Amino acid sequence: MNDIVASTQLPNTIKTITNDLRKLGLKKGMTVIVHSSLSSIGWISGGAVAVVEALMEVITEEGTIIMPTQSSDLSDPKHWSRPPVPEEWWQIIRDNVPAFEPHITPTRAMGKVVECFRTYPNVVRSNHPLGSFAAWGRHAEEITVNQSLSMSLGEESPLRKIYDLDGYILLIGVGYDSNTSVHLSEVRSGACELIKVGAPIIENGERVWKEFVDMDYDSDKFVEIGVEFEQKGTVTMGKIGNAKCRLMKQRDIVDFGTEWFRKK
Amino acid sequence: AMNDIVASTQLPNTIKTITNDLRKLGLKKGMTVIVHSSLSSIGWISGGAVAVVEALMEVITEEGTIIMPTQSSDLSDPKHWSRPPVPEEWWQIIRDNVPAFEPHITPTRAMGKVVECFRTYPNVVRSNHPLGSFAAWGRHAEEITVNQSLSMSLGEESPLRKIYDLDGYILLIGVGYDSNTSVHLSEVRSGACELIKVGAPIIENGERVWKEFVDMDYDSDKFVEIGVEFEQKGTVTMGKIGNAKCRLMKQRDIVDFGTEWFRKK
Ligand SMILES: [Cl-]
Ligand SMILES: [Cl-]
Ligand SMILES: [Cl-]
Ligand SMILES: [Mg+2]
């Protein structure tokens, strides 16, 4: 934090961030899925609240803001490795981890901007216990309704709904490994194996551990895909404070990713 | 790091095992309790913060009352800041631009992940102070949180006094007396600290306003010493929740002790 204020010239505010967003190409009425590192921007007056307000100010309620709200800590620990936990714990975990409830369950590894966004009034969250998304604005409901349990990031997911809307991806101080949309590419290309997974959900007031099938999503190759992707020169670079940012069309990178995976 | 935390845990902490530790320590149905916590101190928990919030609710129940501080010192006048400070050219820009306190939105600072989870629960209500708010759930949640004064934020018009009147309890989960907000009421009652001009952004008659008011220069760095001397009386129940060293005490007990302690100088 001292290091954060030391590397900032002037405070970042809703105003300067709004300014930065516009200069990068974000504009009123866009559909945008946002991925962020708060700290990467520099010191901000109002922290995560400023970033969220700045985004809503640029996009407005006539546009749509989306952010991933994953909650991987609800998953079956059979498959954990960062870190793993003892096998003797696994059935205890399956019988005791609390059910997902959209209005309550914290995200994991999404960031403070997402934790703040998902709590705002009028923000709605899809119902997936592991791979949910939150959305605000014109298409918030359409984007978040009826996510499939199996194939969570596939053709019935919010990622597909953003695709159909010809939306944008905004990366703030993070790389392609945070670019959730490329999972749609994985799905389309068959680039991962299916695995037996589980997660806790509420079925009419009762907690149930639900078993389902999903792709073993792996962001391994996303960074390499982004490098090759940016050689076609359709990604806007720009800064929000100290942060290196990227604005791109979601269909561009999803279509590119699908072909990339197919070539292997 | 999750790696560490896992290492130091023999079996998972769960809603069930936390409920059990809480009851052993002395938490029970219908109790009024203010809670201060470190999540990591407990060891590995299946469900993390949610599990702790749910366990507290399961023990206390709606017929009892859970309170947590939800301070947001990020919103204070930067003239007073030191962990960390910011350049003085920043100060007026901050005053002019920091977003207003909104109880449903404004995040806490330094309160912990259990408080961030708790404050978002559906029937949790939060008091109206831009710097020194509290959140509460259960029987006395409304009475405890309403009508907190802007000036003297942690004094006789605050949730701390309301807890005192309810003869409530304070639970520390892996933390010490420096986290024990209730002791600020002691500072107030004893006149322990000087009155300073403070500020904060609020929504007032329609719009964001930077509001100036007076408050005590609260200082929780004295509380660890008060705590050591208080515990010589043997009225604190000590026990574990997972790996965490915990303490349960009557709020009146420590608030009274602290008032007398400051007055002795
Ligand atoms: Cl009580
Ligand atoms: Cl007195
Ligand atoms: Cl401890
Ligand atoms: Mg419930």
**Do the Cβ atoms of A162 and A181 come closer than 8 Å?**
yes
Contact A13 B90 (CB under 8 A): no
* Cα B175 to ligand 3 centre (Å): 7
For the record, the structure tokens of B33 come out as 């309790």
Contact B46 A104 (CB under 8 A): no
For the record, the structure tokens of A245 come out as 């940012």
| Expt. technique | X-ray
The runs of H, that is alpha helices, within chain A are 2-6, 14-24, 47-59, 90-96, 112-117, 140-144, 158-164, 182-189, 222-230, 250-263
HEC-encoded secondary structure of B93-154? HHHHHCCCECCCCCCCCCCCHHHHHHHCCCCCEECCCCCCCEEEEECCHHHHHCCCCCCCCC
Q: Beta strand pairing status for B125-126 and B32-37? A: unpaired
Give the C-alpha separation, A18 to B99, whole Å: 14
**Do the Cβ atoms of A127 and A147 come closer than 8 Å?**
yes
Nearest to B104 by CA among A41, A103, A35: A103
Chain A residues whose CB is inside 8 A of the B2 CB are 82-83
Contact A47 B107 (CB under 8 A): yes
Give the C-alpha separation, B70 to B36, whole Å: 10
Comparing CB atoms, the residue among A5, A88, A96 nearest residue B15 is A96
What are the structural domain ranges in chain A? Answer: 2-264
Exposure pattern of B161-186 as b/e (b: 16+ CB <10 Å)? Answer: bbbbebebbbbbbbbbbbbbbbbbbb
Contacts of residue B20, defined as CB under 8 A and 6 or more positions apart, other chains included, come to none
Exposure pattern of B122-153 as b/e (b: 16+ CB <10 Å)? Answer: eebbbbebbbbbbbbbbbbbeebbeebbbebb
Give the C-alpha separation, B229 to B261, whole Å: 9
Give the C-alpha separation, A103 to A83, whole Å: 27
Nearest residue on chain A to B91, alpha-carbon basis:
A11
**Do the Cβ atoms of B131 and B153 come closer than 8 Å?**
yes
The answer to whether residue A85 neighbours chain B at the CB level (below 8 Å) is yes
Pick among B94, B105, B119 to test the A interface (most A CBs inside 10 A): B105
Chain B residues whose CB is inside 8 A of the A15 CB are 97
Q: Report which secondary-structure segment, H or E, holds B243.
A: none
Beta bridge mates, A108: none
Nearest to A100 by CA among A200, A232, A196, A178: A200
Write down how long chain B is: 265
Q: Resolution, in Å, please?
A: 1.9
Question: DSSP states of A181-242 as a string?
Answer: THHHHHHHHT-S-EEEEEEEEEETTEEEEEEEEEE----TTHHHHHHHHHTT---EEEEETT
Give the C-alpha separation, B199 to B9, whole Å: 44
> What is the amino acid identity at position B183?
V
Nearest to A11 by CA among B133, B213, B110, B74: B74
Give the C-alpha separation, A244 to A52, whole Å: 18
Instruction: Give the closest-approach CA distance of B253 to chain A in angstroms.
Output: 35
Comparing CB atoms, the residue among B6, B46, B50 nearest residue A106 is B50
**Do the Cβ atoms of B141 and B64 come closer than 8 Å?**
no
